[PDB]
Design a binder for this molecule. Sequence first.
Ligand SMILES: Nc1ncnc2c1ncn2[C@@H]1O[C@H](COP(=O)(O)OP(=O)(O)OC[C@H]2O[C@@H](O)[C@H](O)[C@@H]2O)[C@@H](O)[C@H]1O
Length: 265
Amino acid sequence: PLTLRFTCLGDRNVIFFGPSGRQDGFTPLYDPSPSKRVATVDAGTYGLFIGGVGMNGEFADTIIEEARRNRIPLTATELSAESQEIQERLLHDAERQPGTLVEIDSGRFSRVFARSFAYVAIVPNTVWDESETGKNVGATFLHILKPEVTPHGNEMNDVMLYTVAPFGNASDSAYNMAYKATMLGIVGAVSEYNKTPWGEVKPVEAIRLPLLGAGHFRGRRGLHSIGRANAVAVEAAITRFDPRVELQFMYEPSDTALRGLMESE
Ligand SMILES: Nc1ncnc2c1ncn2[C@@H]1O[C@H](COP(=O)(O)OP(=O)(O)OC[C@H]2O[C@@H](O)[C@H](O)[C@@H]2O)[C@@H](O)[C@H]1O
């Protein structure tokens, strides 16, 4: 865990994982024995469902394995549908009221989610043209996981986030604006959540971020430009909310989450 204090983030300690004992080197979504409640961010898709491949595929696999371990019938198709319907409705309310943490008690009708939230810092398809970025970009959700689907059966791994990153082929104008909107949403949701009663009890105290839009949403875009877009976004979000939480950046071979912020440094 490479810890570096960043002056442009107002003297905040940011973590940067190196490679791991994997063929891919990816950081694990959640730790086996964490000291903090770490909410990992799902690199979501336009369909707003949990599944598919990449990092979105990991979340599904992890949730389902833990579900089957606790002898809860949960298939990939059920998780995809149940998560899409929820995040579809929460998106509707979030867009009705930008900059406000909407909510539904998913626990009443869910084997997976105890409680689900959403937050939209900027209405999709206003500041940018979604024809360039894809739809529902910037949207962000926060789910509290029921104990039976909680990674490694650990009470602290009971929070996740889900966001949709801009497609790389978007204009630098549209891309950077979508990326900051995306980051404001993540930090905003956690900020606003920690102010809720559930936040007092189960406060998020760190955020595990992948390099958003650096996988299948990269297209023809260069990883440097993404490191910039990410660096600028974090600066604004930190300046916006002045958050107490700790940012953690997962590992990918190019290490551009760090290089970009070093440029911002
Ligand atoms: N299993 C994985 N675990 C951890 N990190 C991963 C994994 N696979 C890729 N990554 C890395 O996480 C970041 C995001 O990965 P992706 O989700 O593949 O890229 P993204 O453009 O954000 O998402 C595109 C597509 O992939 C699905 O996750 C999702 O359904 C979306 O449609 C990238 O930096 C990538 O290196």
